[PDB]
Structure 1
Amino acid sequence: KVFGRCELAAAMKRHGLDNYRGYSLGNWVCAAKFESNFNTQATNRNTDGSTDYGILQINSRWWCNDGRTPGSRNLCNIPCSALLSSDITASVNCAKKIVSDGNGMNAWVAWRNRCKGTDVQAWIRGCRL
């Protein structure tokens, strides 16, 4: 599923991301834009052999199992394919764990490089929320 911007914002809000760990909804929408272009099916292989999965590009070395990432953990206790669903529940649940890990949203490189410090509230402007 390719979400619309406001559609994603609404879904993230219902599933409890808005202000989660102090990160406003705009931060999470911005992160998804630059991680996946709002595409739940997005996958990208990293140089270390791990792969990033789904709307928030959650990585197989620490958080999910894809069966092909040597010496990795599955801290979200989910198959990585569960992060590709049109239903964002598994991605949201796992992202909550990630953002609680110690470095906050800096765990998402695209968030650090493209969202952090910017006018992130623009990502939810005009949305019925």
Structure 2
Amino acid sequence: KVFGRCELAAAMKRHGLDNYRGYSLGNWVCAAKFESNFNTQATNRNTDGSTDYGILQINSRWWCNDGRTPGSRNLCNIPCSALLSSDITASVNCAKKIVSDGNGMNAWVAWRNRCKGTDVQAWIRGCRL
């Protein structure tokens, strides 16, 4: 599923992402924009053999099991495929764990490089929230 901008903001707020660990809704939406362009089915293979999955491109090295990332962990205790569902519950649950890991949303390199320190409010602007 390819979410619209405000549709995702609504879903993310519903699932309790609005200011989770101090991060405003606009941050999470911006992160999704540049990670997956709002597409739940996005995948991207890393050079280390790991793979990123879903709206927030959560990686198989630490967070999910895809059964093809030698020596990796599954800290979110889910199949990586669950992160590709049109229902973003698994992605949100897992993301809450990642951002609580110590380095905040810096865990998402696209967030740090493209969202961090920007007017993130713009991403939820005009939306009925």
Partners of 1:80 and 1:65 in 2: CA distance: 5
Cα drift, residue 91 of structure 1 = 0.1
Cα drift, residue 39 of structure 1 = 0.1
Cα drift, residue 101 of structure 1 = 0.2
Cα drift, residue 23 of structure 1 = 0.1
Unaligned runs of 5+ residues in structure 1 are: none
Cα drift, residue 124 of structure 1 = 0.2
Partners of 1:18 and 1:49 in 2: CA distance: 32
Cα drift, residue 45 of structure 1 = 0.1
Cα drift, residue 8 of structure 1 = 0.2
Cα drift, residue 27 of structure 1 = 0.1
| Cα shift readout 1:49-82 (whole Å, capped 9, x = no counterpart) | 0000000000000000000000000000000000
Partners of 1:46 and 1:75 in 2: CA distance: 19
Cα drift, residue 103 of structure 1 = 0.0
Cα drift, residue 11 of structure 1 = 0.2
Counterpart residue number, 2:108: 108
Question: Kindly, what percent of the aligned residue pairs are identical?
Answer: 100
Partners of 2:110 and 2:47 in 1: CA distance: 16
| Cα shift readout 1:21-66 (whole Å, capped 9, x = no counterpart) | 0000000000000000000000000010000000000000000000
Structure 1 ranges of 4+ moved more than 3 A: none
Cα drift, residue 128 of structure 1 = 0.3
Q: What is the number of equivalent residue pairs in this alignment?
A: 129
Query: SS at 1:113's partner residue?
Result: helix
User: Root-mean-square deviation (CA), in Å?
Assistant: 0.2
Query: SS at 2:28's partner residue?
Result: helix
Query: SS at 2:52's partner residue?
Result: strand
Unaligned runs of 5+ residues in structure 2 are: none
